[PDB]
Amino acid sequence: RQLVSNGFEVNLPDQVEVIVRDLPDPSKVKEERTRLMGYWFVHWFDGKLFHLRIKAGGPNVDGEHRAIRTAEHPWLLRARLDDALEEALPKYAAVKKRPFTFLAQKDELIDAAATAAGLSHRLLNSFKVIPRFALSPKIYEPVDGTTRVGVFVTIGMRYDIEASLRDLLEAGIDLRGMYVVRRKRQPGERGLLGRVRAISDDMVQLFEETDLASVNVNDAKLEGSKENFTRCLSALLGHNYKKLLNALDDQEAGYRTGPRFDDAVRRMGEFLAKKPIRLADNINAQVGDRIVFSNEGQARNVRLAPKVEYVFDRTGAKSAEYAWRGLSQFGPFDRPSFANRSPRILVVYPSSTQGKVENFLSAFRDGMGSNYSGFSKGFVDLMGLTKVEFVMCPVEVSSADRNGAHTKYNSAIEDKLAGAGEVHAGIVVLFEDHARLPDDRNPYIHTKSLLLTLGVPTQQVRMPTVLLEPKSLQYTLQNFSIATYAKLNGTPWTVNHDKAINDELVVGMGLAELSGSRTEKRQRFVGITTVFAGDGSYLLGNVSKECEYEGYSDAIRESMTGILRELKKRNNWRPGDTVRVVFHAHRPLKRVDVASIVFECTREIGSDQNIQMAFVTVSHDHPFVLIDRSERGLEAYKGSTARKGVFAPPRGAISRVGRLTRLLAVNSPQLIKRANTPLPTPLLVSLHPDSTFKDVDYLAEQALKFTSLSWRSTLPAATPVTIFYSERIAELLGRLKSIPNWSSANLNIKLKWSRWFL
RNA sequence: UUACUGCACAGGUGACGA
C-alpha cells in the first residue's frame, strides 16, 4: 500500500535566528536585497522584512532579533532553499529561478537520435533538445498538523534552434511566416518578435510584429516550437524526418518513462545528498529519504477510489466499467423516454465530396458491419432510434476558395432550409484548408452560428476524418455518435453516485482566451456548467448562455442560487436536510467571492436546511509525480516485449499532500497509448481554505468520476466536465460574439436540452 | 473542426499579502 513521489525530504534545523523590521512598503525590498547581497538572505512577508545572515561581516542591519522555528514557519527556509539549491549545483547555470531550473551538461538528444536513425545533415548540430531539470522546494504535511519541506524533481526537454537564420535560408528553408524570438531577452523583455516577412541586408522584415517591424538577423532566432522543428527538419531531411522524430521520442523515453524517471530522480537525490547543503556558513540542510505516500504508522496518505461505473438506467442494474461496452450492451441511459426517434439531419458538404460523404453517412447511420466490431450496428440501432432522415445540402465550393467559402455554405443552408421544413440537427463537412481560416471567413464558425441561431445543433467534421481508414473510422464514429445523440438532447450515460445527502450540486467555470493572432491581446470569456446528484447518478443540468469575463463571480452566484431554488422545489427538502454545493475551476476563487457566494446560497436555501460548500481547483501543471513501483505495465500492443504504463499508478489513486490538497491519478496503464509515453503527471486537487465542506478525498473522487462524464468521447476527459464543457462553451460563445447575424436567442429555447457545445 | 494523449514553445496570468 505505497506510492512513491519525485520528492526528497529536506532535513532542516529546528530553528534559525533572524533579524526583523517593519517594512509596510515593499517597493523598498529590491534595493535592500541588493545592498545586503552576499551577507544576508532577505524575505518580505506580512508587511515585515526578515533577514537571515549567510556570511560574517557587514553591512549592519537594525531590527528585532527573533527565532523562527521551522516547524511553525517553514516558508522562510523553503524560500532560502530556492537559492541554496542553486548554490549547491555551482557547475549548472540557472536557466530559471524559483524553481531552480537547469540543463544537462553533456546530454543532447538530436545528435543521439540522428545517429540512432542513421540520419545526418550539416545543420543538425544547431537543433538542440537538452534535458531540463527543475528542483522545487515544496511544503507538505505527512500527517495533519506537521509540515515538512521536500525538494521535488521534475524533468522536461528544452527545444532550441540555435542556427543562424542566414544559414537556414541558405540551406533552402522557406522562413516566410515562421515565428522568430529574441536570442537575448533583456530584463523583463518580450521574447516574441513576430513572423518572418523576408530578409533584406543583415535584417529580418517582420509582419504580425510585437514591437518594431524589423530586427537584425543576428539578434533573432526561430522560436523553439514543434512547428519550427518539423518545418526545418522536413526541409532538411524529409520525409525521412519522421524517423528522426520517432528516434527523438525514443531518446526522451530514456528520461521520462516511469522506471527511467524514477532513476533520474534517484540519481538527482544521490547527488544532492552527497554533502550537507549550505543554508548559511554555520547552518546546513540534508536531503533525506524519498517521500512516499502510504498508510504506514500514523500516516493515512493513500487511497484507491473505486472504479467509476458508467450507468445506463435509473435502476443502477445496467452498468459497465467502460462507456462503449455499456452503450453497446444497454443502449443509452434515456432510451425509454427519448422523444425524437426519427431525427431529420441536414448534411452540408462541398458538392465534390458527395461520394465520400455518402459512404461516411451510411457507415454512421447503418454501421460498418460485423467486420468492424467497434462500430457494427450504426447510430440508429446503437441509440434505439427508428430511423434517421438525411437532408442533403451540397455546396458549390472548392478547397482553394479562401475568401468566400463561408458565404457559400450559409447561402446554401438558407436556401435549403426555406423549403425543407424542420431539421433537428446538422452535419457540416469542411475542407481541411478551411478549418482554421480567420473567423471572418471561417465556415466552421459561420455555419455553427447560423444553425445555432436557428436552433439546430451541429456536429462538424473535416474531410481527413471523413476519409479515415476503417480501423480508425470505427472509434471516430463511436465519438461522433455519442456527441450527436447528446446534441439531439440525448443522455448517453451517467456515472454512479452513492446517495449520501439530501441534494448535491456541482458548478464549474471555464475560461477561453481569444484573439485573431499572437500580436493581438487575448480577450477572456467564460462558461458555466452544472451537474446535479440524482438517485444512483450524476445528471447534467443547464449551461450558461452569457460568456462575460467581467462579472463572472456574479454569474456563478446567479447560477448557483437559481438552481438551488429549482432543486428545493423539485425535491421538496425537509427541515434538517443537508445540501452540498461544490465549485470546480482551474484557478482558485478570491476569498471575497467565496464569501459572497456562500452568503447568497445560504440565504437562498434558508434556515430550515444545512449547507456545506466546497471550492475546488484542479491543476494540471504542478511539480508532483506519483510512481507505483509494483506496476509492471502492459503490452504496448499485444504481444510485444515493450511495455507501456510501467510504474503508472492506477486510475483513482488519491494521495494526500497536505490538509487541502490531494493528488489524483487519472491515466492508468490501460489508458496510456504508447510504450514511449512518459509517466503521467497526476491532477492536483486543492480545496479553498474558506470551504465549509472539507473532505478533499471525496472531492478528488468526485472530480475523477466527472472525467468519465464527457460525451465528446468514449474515452475519459482530462478534466471534470464541469470545467471542460465550460471551456468549450466559453470558446464557442466568445467566437460567436463577433460573427454577424449570430443571436443566442435559441440557446435557452430550442437548444435548452441540446449538448450543442460538445 | 470525431476525439484522446500532452509535448513543445509562446503569451503571460492568477491568488494571497502589506
Added chain:
DNA sequence: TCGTCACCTGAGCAGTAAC
C-alpha cells in the same frame, strides 16, 4: 504601485482509440 508563490491557455505537432 510592490513582494511572493504559483501555474493556466493557445498554436501546431504527432501517435493512438480502456476487454
